[PDB]
Structure formats: structure tokens, C-alpha cells
């Protein structure tokens, strides 16, 4: 079936890499409790970070990007989203029992004001999913000057371009989640990391799992993490047909959002959404449906083609 | 922010290591070349199924049951992952010291009210009150003792209306598992593993088995996508292939049984481990000039409170130790 609803990279973890991870993982390994953030992930995750003042005590890993972002709600007072968000911010949350608030975004999707202060940290997708459009650095630092310690979701930053994780430098009350279930197509090995103060990363890895990230996964984002330029030209191709297909829905009368995720979003009340949905669900094509609209998902060319030619005949 | 519980930290490994009941051999390479020979590169990039219909299936198999089914059994990122979302479902967890160390971790981590009540001087089930609501742990084999709770212990809690989270992490090194109390009660789960057993802790795949109502609250609060694609087709190879792990656990026990055998012999106070690993008991200023022999040949055994935990290795490891042991 035509799956474009979780987000996933279209193109499958390079069967190349496999085969290194295939020949880098000693089998003698599998036996012990590797470590969880390898010393030699961190050092090839500080070099994807590319930055000049972050160093191994200033990152730490995650089971996917959802365990520190499942993780972190257990860290702190209060969780802060705002709907539409990231779908599992609201589940994990109550599976948690973090207490949280969802203050939707301003009808111009832009951060509401919150009286949140430090004690709560307020989860961020920048991209912001499912809108995948991004909140300007301004807004962020509104929240960070608050003192709330912010939870940057950066799980569309290779979507994206640039990243707030320079915020680290002025602010200790921030921490960014990235992960390689998108960019990587490394959604099935579970793989995130964050980059925050040590005092941050310290507690974290006091909460995480010690060893939530399989010995095969990090060998996987390691390597991955090696051959960076095939995923960033895999990137270069998600974005171009986001793009495509942006300036397409809109050419076709469609309200949809300046997202700069590795997916687009289509606004649409209830009863003409649900239609396409049923529709969709007949051409065997899968798509996911939020609130005031559709996020369908990029994935190769046909796939997305697809997409586009069932709302030529629907509006 | 103000948490001062455990500092995470790294087990710098020795020569020999023998402190985490890791099991002895590698991962059949055999088996290796078999994961990678299923690995769909395809499945990586989506959002594998956490606990994987196949790897249900497999778990089924291997558990030899009737009445269990596809809705009674969960994966976790490791018993552990199981471990510690248990602890967010229940309002209190309660274990028994010398229970797992880490149970104290996750729930002081976790947030989670706990009560922690020790076992008799007979490794035994003390006497508490738990009652639902409450989630308490029992390690079967137990860690690090090894020794086993008799089934009347694990009913004597269960009957109590108390969620039981039965960690049986070491089953295979031991021959019953109370899983088929779940056939009679329906507050019991059953935590397994393939760390020890397999040769898989590396690769986090721990499963628990449960009543269907359970599985499906605990699918509701733990991650939805627990276990790697990897982790989960190391697992499914894993039980495809338990006959060569059944030789490695029989190896185990066997060179377990000689170990407990061979101290009792130089008149050490040992448990009656079931585990794959032995504890021997001893006082302070008499374990700490064993470590310090010990951490002087390279020696890493896990020191507890009253004594140590040592893990089943190899042949030559094994008989290290002994020698190692004989000297005092």
C-alpha cells in the first residue's frame, strides 16, 4: 500500500550500510550490555552537530526520539505543547503522568503566551509537526526567557536547515532532540539523541533506560552517521519534492502550511477531509489525517505523484 | 532541577568480566548472519511494529502454551524498558531486597512511589501490604541470590489483589516459570528477557506476558515503538534457533552447578542460584580483599551487599575463579 502517514524516509537504509554494520558488530558484543550513548557515537554525533562549543557531556541518546521526549516529561513539573503537535507528546504525557498543557498555537500558528515559567518544559517540534512550518527563532527564546526549560523537537532539522541548538550557548534550559528515524531511514532501529547543558544531559541520563539504545542501532547511527552525504542528497530529494508538491496543492486551491518537514500539510474541514480519506482509503493509498487538515507524507516520486493526482479529481 | 539519585556512570570492563549475567558465549554468528540474511533494509525506514506480529508468535511458541495468545504477550526495550514503564502504571512498586538493583533506580527515577521491604533471612517473601493499585516485583530466579520463590510465595502476593510483575529474566537457567498462573489470575505479568539467555542484552528485546486487559494498558503507556526491527528479528532468529541456547543454558547450569558444588566444597556460604551467574555471601573486610585479589588479576564480579554476585562464564573463567577462591 502507498504509505505516506508516519513520516518515514521512502528510501530504505542503504543496503550498504547494512552490510558494514553487518561486519562492524562483533557477535562477542551481542552478549554484554553495551553502552548505551557508545563513546564513538557521540563523537560522530558532535561532528553532525558541527558545533564549536559542545562536547560528549553535552549529548546523550534516546530509544527514537520519543524515549527522551518520553523521558524528559518524566524530568520535569509540567509539560507544555501546543495542538497540532506532535500526536505522541499528548499520549506519552498521560502515559507518563506528566502533567501538561496544551495551549493551542495562534491562529497564525505562532507560540501562544503561556505562563510557564522554570519547573515546566515546553515541547517544541521546530519543524513543527504535523504543520511541519517553522516557528522563527524569536518565539523560542520568548518561552526560554521565561526560564521553562524548552524540549526543541528538531526531528525535521535535516528538512529544515538550520537548527537552534546555538540557543545552548546562552541558554542552559533548552535541549534538542533529533533522531535518525527520518533523515536515516533508521525509524525501526530507534535512535534519537539530545544536545543539552550537561547539568541537563547528567539528569537525563540518571531517567533514561541505561541502555535504551540496542548495540546494532547505534552501530547503525554510527554508521549512518559516517556516510552522511547519501542521506543529505536522500534529504535534498524529500525537500525538493516537498516542495514540489507544496506550490502544487496550493496551485490546486488548497490551503496548506509552509512546512519544512519531510511532509506537507493540507487544511480541510471535517466533512470534505473525511471524504478524500475514504477515497484514499480505496486507492490503497494511506495518508495522516490530524484536525484541520491531512499530513501526507513524501516518499518517492510516484508515491507523492499519487497523492497529488487524487486531489485533482476530489477539489 | 534537583535530582540527586544515581549518577549514571560506565562499568569499565576487566579481563574478565563476570558482573552483569551476561551470557558467556557470543551471539551465534551462525545466527548473526541469519538476522542480516532476513534484515529488510525496506523496514528500517518505516515505523516497524513495535511488538512484532511474527515476534509474538515466535514468543508464543517458545513459551509452549495454550491459552496464551497474541494479546498476552508485549515486547519492552528490555525487561528493564518493561521494568520501568510498569512502574508509571501503578500508583506504587514494591521489591525485595536483594531484588534487582536497578528496580530501586527506575522507580526513584521514574517518580514512583516504593516501597522496599527485604527478604527474610531465608530469601524469602516478607510480609507486606500490597493490594491493587500496587505493583510489586519479583525477580524468579531472584537477583542477585539466584535462589528461587516457591510458587506459593508468588500466589501468596498474588491472591492479595496486588499487580504482579513475576521478572523471570532468568526462566531459561531455570526450569519452571509461573506463567501459567495467568490461566487464574489476571493482575500477574510475566517479564522475560533475552539479555542472559540468548546472548542478546546488547540488543534490548525483553517481553512480558500478561492478561490481554493488561498488555493492552501497557501498550498504552510504555513507547509505541520499543524494539528495533534488528533487536526484534535478533529475537525471532533467537527462538528459531533456541536448541543451540537450551546447550548454552545446559552449559551453564552445568558449569553453574559444579561452581556452587566446588564452594560449598572450600566451605563457602552459597545461594541456591538458579541464574546464570552464583552468589556467594560474604562479610566486609573479607569480599573487599577478594575484590581487591580480584580487580588485581582483572576480575570484575558485581559486589553486593552481603557478598558477591558472580556471573557464569566460560570454562576458563569459570575455573579462574576458583582458583581465584582457593587461596582464601
Given at each position: 500500500k502507498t504509505y505516506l502517514a508516519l513520516n518515514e524516509n521512502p528510501f530504505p537504509f542503504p543496503e550498504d550500510l547494512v552490510d558494514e554494520v553487518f561486519r562492524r558488530l562483533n557477535s562477542?558484543?551481542?552478549?554484554?550490555?553495551?553502552?548505551?550513548?557508545?563513546?564513538?557515537?557521540?563523537?560522530?554525533?558532535?561532528?553532525?552537530l558541527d558545533t564549536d562549543f559542545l562536547s560528549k557531556n553535552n549529548v546523550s541518546v534516546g530509544n527514537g526520539a520519543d524515549e527522551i521526549i518520553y523521558v524528559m516529561m518524566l524530568m520535569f513539573d509540567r509539560s507544555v505543547f501546543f495542538p497540532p503537535t506532535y500526536s505522541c507528546y499528548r499520549?506519552?504525557?498521560?502515559?507518563?503522568?506528566?502533567?501538561?498543557?496544551?495551549?493551542?498555537?495562534?491562529?497564525?500558528?505562532?507560540?501562544?503566551?503561556?505562563?510557564?515559567?522554570?519547573?515546566?518544559v515546553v515541547f517544541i517540534p521546530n519543524p513543527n509537526n504535523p504543520t511541519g512550518h517553522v516557528f522563527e527563532r524569536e518565539e523560542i527564546e520568548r518561552i526560554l526567557k521565561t526560564g521553562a526549560?524548552?524540549?526543541?523537537?528538531?526531528?525535521?532539522?535535516?528538512?529544515?536547515?538550520?537548527?537552534?541548538?546555538?540557543?545552548?550557548?546562552?541558554?542552559?534550559?533548552?535541549?534538542?532532540?533529533?533522531?535518525?528515524?527520518?533523515?536515516?531511514?533508521?525509524?525501526?532501529?530507534?535512535?534519537?539523541?539530545?544536545?543539552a547543558?550537561?547539568?541537563?544531559?547528567?539528569?537525563?541520563?540518571?531517567?533514561?533506560?541505561?541502555f535504551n539504545v540496542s548495540y546494532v542501532s547505534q552501530m547503525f547511527a554510527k554508521v549512518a552517521l559516517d556516510h552522511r552525504e547519501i542521506f543529505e542528497e536522500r534529504t535534498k530529494f524529500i525537500v525538493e519534492e516537498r516542495e514540489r508538491m507544496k506550490s502544487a496543492l496550493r496551485e490546486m486551491g488548497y490551503r496548506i502550511t509552509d512546512s519544512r518537514g519531510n511532509f506537507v500539510f493540507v487544511f480541510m474541514e471535517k466533512e470534505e477531509k473525511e471524504?478524500?480519506?475514504?477515497?484514499?482509503?480505496?486507492?490503497?493509498?494511506?495518508?495522516?489525517?490530524?484536525?484541520?487538515?491531512?499530513?501526507?507524507?513524501?516518499?518517492?516520486?510516484?508515491?507523492?505523484?499519487?497523492?497529488?493526482?487524487?486531489?485533482?479529481?476530489?477539489?
Open positions: 562477542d558484543a551481542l552478549r554484554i550490555y553495551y553502552d548505551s550513548p557508545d563513546e564513538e557515537l557521540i563523537e560522530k554525533i558532535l561532528s553532525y499520549i506519552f504525557a498521560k502515559a507518563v503522568g506528566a502533567k501538561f498543557l496544551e495551549v493551542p498555537l495562534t491562529k497564525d500558528l505562532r507560540i501562544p503566551e503561556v505562563n510557564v515559567g522554570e519547573g515546566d526549560f524548552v524540549a526543541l523537537d528538531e526531528a525535521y532539522y535535516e528538512f529544515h536547515g538550520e537548527s537552534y541548538v546555538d540557543f545552548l550557548k546562552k541558554y542552559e534550559n533548552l535541549a534538542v532532540i533529533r533522531t535518525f528515524s527520518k533523515a536515516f531511514s533508521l525509524a525501526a532501529q530507534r535512535v534519537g539523541y539530545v544536545v547543558s550537561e547539568k541537563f544531559i547528567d539528569a537525563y541520563n540518571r531517567v533514561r533506560l541505561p471524504r478524500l480519506l475514504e477515497h484514499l482509503r480505496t486507492k490503497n493509498v494511506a495518508v495522516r489525517s490530524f484536525r484541520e487538515g491531512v499530513r501526507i507524507t513524501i516518499g518517492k516520486r510516484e508515491e507523492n505523484d499519487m497523492i497529488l493526482r487524487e486531489l485533482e479529481v476530489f477539489k
